[PDB]
Amino acid sequence: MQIFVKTLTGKTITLEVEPSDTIENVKAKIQDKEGIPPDQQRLIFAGKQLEDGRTLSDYNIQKESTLHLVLRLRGG
Amino acid sequence: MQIFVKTLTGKTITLEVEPSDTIENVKAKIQDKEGIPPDQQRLIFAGKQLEDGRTLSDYNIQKESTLHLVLRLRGG
Amino acid sequence: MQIFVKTLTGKTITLEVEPSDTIENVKAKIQDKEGIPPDQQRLIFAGKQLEDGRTLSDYNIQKESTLHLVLRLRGG
Ligand SMILES: [Zn+2]
Ligand SMILES: [Zn+2]
Ligand SMILES: [Zn+2]
Ligand SMILES: [Zn+2]
Ligand SMILES: [Zn+2]
Ligand SMILES: [Zn+2]
């Protein structure tokens, strides 16, 4: 299925994914497409911060959903 | 009066507003223009997060001010 | 050495620096190139918000590192 990821650089990136894909998997796809290290990526869906070990299914992310890519902030 | 709203991508939206307008009103204006649900919009002025029930004049947002539209981050 | 800085919208700035440069020094370099007042700059490295009185060395920022500008948020 496809989802879309909006970047601060003004891009909408289409990704081919499955419900069972982890957020880690999605970040790896973004690295392939956009060259951004996964450890600097934060994904947002309807305001919610998506955790690496959860799946798209876990967040009820369905076909043609839009995510936003923002900078991951860590503290320290 | 006019204010300017910069999106995450740096696009400037020009809005016709009034000093007594609420932030909720301004977000409705962005929805009508851009189709972003107000629920998903966060506005920032000079670093400060703007609350929906307060007015532009409450925040000393004057003619020709610039706001930033960012994601309305939430738990869950 | 050289480092890179990404603007709010992902433009890349190249800076000449030394390890002993303070973050305040870096922000002055950014002001000279981009015009952004230092008091409005917030720099991130490895997800961490950088403090003006600390140095690049203090953050283990080495040659060819990338920093990001993000919107400077405040309370009130
Ligand atoms: Zn499969
Ligand atoms: Zn957006
Ligand atoms: Zn009126
Ligand atoms: Zn700004
Ligand atoms: Zn970046
Ligand atoms: Zn020197």
Numbering used by the authors:
A (entry chain B), B (entry chain C), C (entry chain A): 1 to 76
What does the original paper state about this entry?
Polymeric ubiquitin (Ub) chains, in which several Ub proteins are connected through specific isopeptide bonds, are known to play regulatory roles in various cellular processes, including cell cycle progression, DNA repair, transcriptional regulation, and apoptosis. In contrast, the crystal structures of Lys48-linked Ub chains often exhibit closed conformations, in which the hydrophobic patches are shielded due to Ub-Ub interactions in the chains.
We prepared the n-triUb and n-tetraUb in native and cyclic forms by in vitro enzymatic reactions and chromatographic separation. Each of these cyclic forms gave a single set of chemical shifts, indicating their symmetrical structures. In contrast, the spectrum of c-triUb was significantly different from that of c-diUb in terms of the chemical shifts of the peaks originating from the hydrophobic surface and the segment linking the Ub units. We determined a crystal structure of c-triUb at a resolution of 1.33 Å. As expected from the NMR spectra, c-triUb adopts a three-fold symmetric structure in which the hydrophobic surfaces, including Leu8, Ile44, and Val70, are partially exposed, distinct from the closed conformation observed for c-diUb and c-tetraUb.
